Amino acid sequence: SGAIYVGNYRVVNRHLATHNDWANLVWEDSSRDLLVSSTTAQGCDTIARCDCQTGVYYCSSRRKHYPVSFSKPSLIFVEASEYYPARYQSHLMLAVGHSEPGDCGGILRCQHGVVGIVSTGGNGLVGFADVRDLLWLDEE
Ligand SMILES: */O=C(\[N][C]C1=[C][C]=C(F)[C]=[C]1)C1=[C]N([C][C])N=[C]1
Numbered sequence: 001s002g003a004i005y006v007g008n009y010r011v012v013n014r015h016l017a018t019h020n021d022w023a024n025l026v027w028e029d030s031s032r033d034l035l036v037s038s039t040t041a042q043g044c045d046t047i048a049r050c051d052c053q054t055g056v057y058y059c060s061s062r063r064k065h066y067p068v069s070f071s072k073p074s075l076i077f078v079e080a081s082e083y084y085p086a087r088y089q090s091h092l093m094l095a096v097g098h099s100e101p102g103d104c105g106g107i108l109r110c111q112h113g114v115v116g117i118v119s120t121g122g123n124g125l126v127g128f129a130d131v132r133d134l135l136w137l138d139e140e
């Protein structure tokens, strides 16, 4: 579990979005595993605006933050998980590291702020849904 809180937006994995998220929907994209809802309170996070390929991510199934190198966001085949069938996911970054289903929502951060959230795992990789292209998160 986990979310990004930027301005008056809440960014969650689409597959973990709640009824209250869907009832207050700003934007969602199944191909990216992302959903954004509106918030009453302003959030503490800053979104990275950069092309870093190194950062640190939180792994709840280890209670640990790990430094990783990661691929640039791309259209990647993802094997079946507990929450999605095998499919192509877009805007996905991969790193070597541990990720189980409940790790989804852990933040990946670089020197510029939040890069994305954990979205995939298995076979010794962790996949992150990028948010650095969503420039509209930073206003309005
Ligand atoms: O519930 C609302 N939004 C989703 C949400 C927000 C915070 C959170 F911790 C979980 C889910 C919502 C939005 N608004 C209007 C701004 N009222 C309720």
Ligand SMILES: [Zn+2]
Binding pocket: 048, 049, 050, 051, 052, 110, 111, 112, 113
């Ligand atoms: Zn960066």
